[PDB]
Specification:
Chain B: This is Envelope glycoprotein gp160. Chain B: It comes from Human immunodeficiency virus type 1. The complex is a heterohexamer, with three copies of chain A and three copies of chain B. Chain A has one helix and no strands. By secondary structure, chain A is mainly α. Chain A has one helix at 2-27. The relative contact order of chain A is 0.12. Chain B is 93% helix and 0% strand. Chain B contains one helix and no strands. The chains are: A mainly alpha (29), B mainly alpha (27). At the E-F interface, helix 1 of E face helix 1 of F.
């Protein structure tokens, strides 16, 4: 299960950075 | 564009939940 | 703790599926 | 702006359970 | 005005996911 | 590690109470409006 956890954590990190962009993109309104 | 973030968030929720779920298997 | 985690995980799965359903209804009649 | 409240509430309520799950897992660790 | 109080919650929610993710990472490093 | 986790737990607990309070007043500050 550990390879899966590593992959899920990296996906999360990438999703977090995206959401913060998409919120920062909603901040530029 | 908040409705695309809204979907980003729900998507994060699932990411997080599945990590905890997987960690439980380790335990 | 094991029983308590299994229950919270399962309540969350429920809440996820509902959160997903709801986001679709929001997306549904927002596209109207 | 009503169906957004139901979603926001379900997000915050599920973040509470993720956080609880983590708390409880911390006693297992 | 109400549309402003909902951008606060959204930042607060996104920060909470960063919070939880960081904990899960830390805890996986112990696991 | 345990010091880090419990730091993150506590900050999540604080952020959760904050989000929950914000959610509340947000809801009332509408229904009434």
């Amino acid at each position: 299960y550990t390879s899966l956890i590593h992959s899920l954590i990296e996906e999360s990190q990438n999703q977090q950075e995206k959401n913060e962009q998409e919120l920062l993109e909603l901040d530029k309104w | 564009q908040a409705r695309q973030l809204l979907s980003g968030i729900v998507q994060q929720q699932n990411n997080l939940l599945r990590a905890i779920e997987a960690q439980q298997h380790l335990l």
